[PDB]
């Protein structure tokens, strides 16, 4: 992890975040041996795209809920109950 390089993006839900997530502890890794939660898809018309979310981003926190080393369902539950504003901490390569 590189927490000093992480980004914070806020999705203003209008139901509907306009993303797909993949991965999780014990799941088939999204890339290499990384079992993290990744943004696998971003809808061009959804709020996540407008908030600056991109495919390939690694999801590390959602509204205070830490997702480092989390199982897939834990991220889903954190995102489904996040509320109108979904503050996500992500890491991307630059």
């Amino acid at each position: 992890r590189i927490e000093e390089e992480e980004l914070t993006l806020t999705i203003l839900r209008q139901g509907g975040l306009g993303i797909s997530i993949a991965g999780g502890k014990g799941s088939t890794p999204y890339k290499g041996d990384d079992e993290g939660i990744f943004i696998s898809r971003v809808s061009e018309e959804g709020p996540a795209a407008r908030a600056g979310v991109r495919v390939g981003d690694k999801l590390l926190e959602v509204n205070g809920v830490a997702l480092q080393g989390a199982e897939h369902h834990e991220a889903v539950e954190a995102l489904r109950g996040a509320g109108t504003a979904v503050q996500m901490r992500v890491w991307r390569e630059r």
Binding site: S20, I21, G26, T28, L79
Partner: peptide, 9 residues
């Protein structure tokens, strides 16, 4: 030999 999980939100 794992379960691939993907969820649209």
């Amino acid at each position: 030999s794992r379960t691939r999980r993907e969820t649209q939100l």
